[PDB]
């Protein structure tokens, strides 16, 4: 294929995205969840890991690592420690809200995914870390887990397969950084949400100092379907190395901001117009898009005209797919203020552990604040570019990268707006 | 037999498995710059001053924490390495207070000296600086926490060496603060050692306050007699007066610590 | 933490009396060697220099820190006391 | 078959201890936990 | 706003706090969720539980959690000051949390903040004199397609207009508890004015299943 989009509803995985059907066990089973789960568990981890590899599934938490190879780090003989699957339901990236819909409307996909994914990893239990603000969502997930226990689908002798598996839910307490995979582990252990250095990698030393895999909610919740319908089925959607379906969030200045499932590699223009009702004020009223959540660099309208929504297409546009959260800004937006407010967000979420982000992000924030008013000189723009490059690649975790990239996108595509603002301040003073 | 070969600026060196990049560098006599790393504490990897380029690796690695792999070539003076140090030093100094004349660390300050040797020679920071309130932790250790660079050495020392878990960090981000949260005195027989290991003038000897500068002191290597451990010490004197007592490193006796009574 | 002042061998002499000058209180001395410090590449060079000059001397073996076993992973041990309670 | 109604209305009646009551109810179903071998790292 | 504690008559080690018998049973279930030898993993849920009983965390509440789990008090202090959901000062009966990050800013969350302030007569970060409402700004609450939105305690209120939020507040004062969710006509996150997908009845068990499974 060379064209993507127009995903058929028979090919949509999250068939209860909008919560118009019973989310509890009876509704989930009637839609195809928990079907032949024993047979999947009896095929063994190597077969399960084989399907995931053949599917071309990539991490849906924002980094997009190939899932089959990542999960295979856990397929090693036991050294005596317990093994765990940690499901990352922190869902903290601004613009992102797809994992919220799975947890409250398709919780039994996530629970079954935890079992199927945990079997492939050899885990004994799954810890689902869910942000503390998602209290009602966490309560729904907990009711679904109880249903799954009472039906024998999880627990001792799960699905009758002879495999023991537990599913714990542990709530967060308000921290974007706790979505980072090793900060999440540190939080489950009762410490501050400060990321770990690597190595060790979690597959060797993770939660409680044990073999551990952290997987995104969307990543785990699709694993049972990939196994039932085949990795070949999943790989048949999207471009090569960009396989599958994807949950998109379209927010900002669109007519009908929404969450939808669509084929990977759909054009950004097609996605905004078909599902979100188009850009407020028309397509020509578009100024810029943030394609993959606040951490990804913005792209201007000229780039949005033809860009495809997948990992490799957006990297060539000098940004990334990220969580696939699309924040649209129309021509009435103060683009400098919009990005400045994202830098303020990163200033509030920095764990403060490491120097470049503890000091640098707060420094970038003060500079962006003056750029909004124009109270600066054009020489400071290149100074700000160099500052962001001293943070990127020098910090412990990717939050420092996630703060530098939005600034670089703004300077990359909107330098004349920044300079014009400085020129205006110079006259009025 | 178990040793692996790595290169430091292209020089072959044989190290045990688990040896860090930082440890490999010291075998050929190079000392990687550091703030948070201390050889007697647990690795932290938060200051980032020790970042170093590995040849053919696009990303600089924290030398203090990263184990070296076979065949690695550590580039301790490449442009990538030097620029990482300059950027990190710039971040450390952005909010650091202009206190050197009134600060007791001046003249024997790792922040001063590593700024001279690895940092830039000027500033491009144009904002206001952070200011932090002081914490009272007893009559021995004066705190000027605006100078703290959040290296967590004192926290690790108190927990691991002294076995006291009363120090930590509160808050988040640029506002993260080292201290006790509550009003608490850090009185431990080994407490005065946090003065030595604090790289900056954040933690200083209250008795020593303002009395001397390091360059004018004469150093007399001697022995403690306040107990029978025989801790090795340095007696600092100036113009015929004893000014203070410092630990002298002895691996088989006191390592690099002394008790409060000795100090 | 810098180790650059522990590379070379030093020769110094025994400390003698310093007293307060009656006029100003400055530190007075009658020891012509009070400030004499000599540097040497090796202890053997220093010993050689002391012997030909006729000085009685003491030699103290160089103390070098012993190599330590550091592991960042040990901070999170499943079942050992090296697990840290904070970062 | 109907699409026109929201069917996730149970959380209009959740309360302060809903989540913690569910976890308490789940306790009887959990497998025995693994043991590090000591009361805590400080033992 | 401050991350250092100072004893006051209202907040000190002697400020009375203890879990009720029912919350001790809830605590036992929490601790049992983690491996033996790693009870410090219960600090966040138990500290959150202290807050749900008490409404906020006095220092003595923090000291009690440290005692029950046998962890140094400083380690609990670190958690309480790191995570923004813990209240180290008393808040009103209704903690109004207005999201003001860019996606919500782009859909006029500022108008929501302004209406709440005019209605309650307070500023951001203040409690009303009746001690019923506390108003703060927060970062992305993960409901961006439903911007502008607020959280009041555990409930989300979505797709708000300045009239809608005042109606929610008027209900709260009266003692009624308003229904969470969008106030615009849609139920959740579907596009407004018509579903663009998931309009056909979902397939049943065994659809599209590969051969051999
Ligand atoms: C600051 C920060 C926040 C993150 N938040 C999340 C998150 O909320 N959900 C998520 O799945 N991944 C998040 N990640 C990415 C995780 O670190 C990790 O890549 C992901 O959980 C891996 O799972 P996956 O491969 O299935 O995507 C975050 C990363 C950073 C640096
Ligand atoms: S980059 Fe920021 S969030 Fe990540 S460890 Fe460093 S200070 Fe913490
Ligand atoms: S700690 Fe060092 S750099 Fe900072 S004021 Fe004191 S002497 Fe100067
Ligand atoms: S007080 Fe000193 S030793 Fe402690 S964290 Fe700050 S700089 Fe490091
Ligand atoms: S010395 Fe390595 S990061 Fe601090
Ligand atoms: S930006 Fe407000 S909910 Fe995400
Ligand atoms: K000091």
mmCIF file of N, CA and C and ligand atoms in Angstrom, chain E residues 99 101 103-104 140-144 149, ligand 6:
data_model
loop_
_atom_site.group_PDB
_atom_site.id
_atom_site.type_symbol
_atom_site.label_atom_id
_atom_site.label_comp_id
_atom_site.label_asym_id
_atom_site.label_seq_id
_atom_site.Cartn_x
_atom_site.Cartn_y
_atom_site.Cartn_z
ATOM 1 N N UNK E 99 -7.082 23.409 35.124
ATOM 2 C CA UNK E 99 -5.960 23.148 34.232
ATOM 3 C C UNK E 99 -5.699 24.356 33.345
ATOM 4 N N UNK E 101 -2.570 24.443 31.284
ATOM 5 C CA UNK E 101 -1.529 24.109 30.326
ATOM 6 C C UNK E 101 -2.028 24.360 28.903
ATOM 7 N N UNK E 103 -2.841 23.082 25.894
ATOM 8 C CA UNK E 103 -4.072 22.615 25.237
ATOM 9 C C UNK E 103 -5.330 23.214 25.840
ATOM 10 N N UNK E 104 -5.389 23.331 27.166
ATOM 11 C CA UNK E 104 -6.519 23.987 27.811
ATOM 12 C C UNK E 104 -6.454 25.500 27.666
ATOM 13 N N UNK E 140 -1.550 19.770 33.015
ATOM 14 C CA UNK E 140 -2.436 18.907 32.248
ATOM 15 C C UNK E 140 -2.987 17.782 33.107
ATOM 16 N N UNK E 141 -4.309 17.719 33.200
ATOM 17 C CA UNK E 141 -4.993 16.675 33.944
ATOM 18 C C UNK E 141 -5.331 15.475 33.072
ATOM 19 N N UNK E 142 -4.842 15.444 31.836
ATOM 20 C CA UNK E 142 -5.049 14.292 30.982
ATOM 21 C C UNK E 142 -6.445 14.185 30.424
ATOM 22 N N UNK E 143 -7.116 15.314 30.229
ATOM 23 C CA UNK E 143 -8.440 15.388 29.633
ATOM 24 C C UNK E 143 -8.466 16.490 28.587
ATOM 25 N N UNK E 144 -7.432 16.516 27.746
ATOM 26 C CA UNK E 144 -7.177 17.688 26.912
ATOM 27 C C UNK E 144 -8.213 17.836 25.804
ATOM 28 N N UNK E 149 -11.217 22.325 31.288
ATOM 29 C CA UNK E 149 -11.749 21.418 32.288
ATOM 30 C C UNK E 149 -11.162 21.769 33.645
HETATM 31 S S1 LIG F 6 -3.924 20.584 28.874
HETATM 32 FE FE1 LIG F 6 -5.599 20.647 30.356
HETATM 33 S S2 LIG F 6 -6.246 18.518 30.563
HETATM 34 FE FE2 LIG F 6 -4.433 18.444 29.259
#
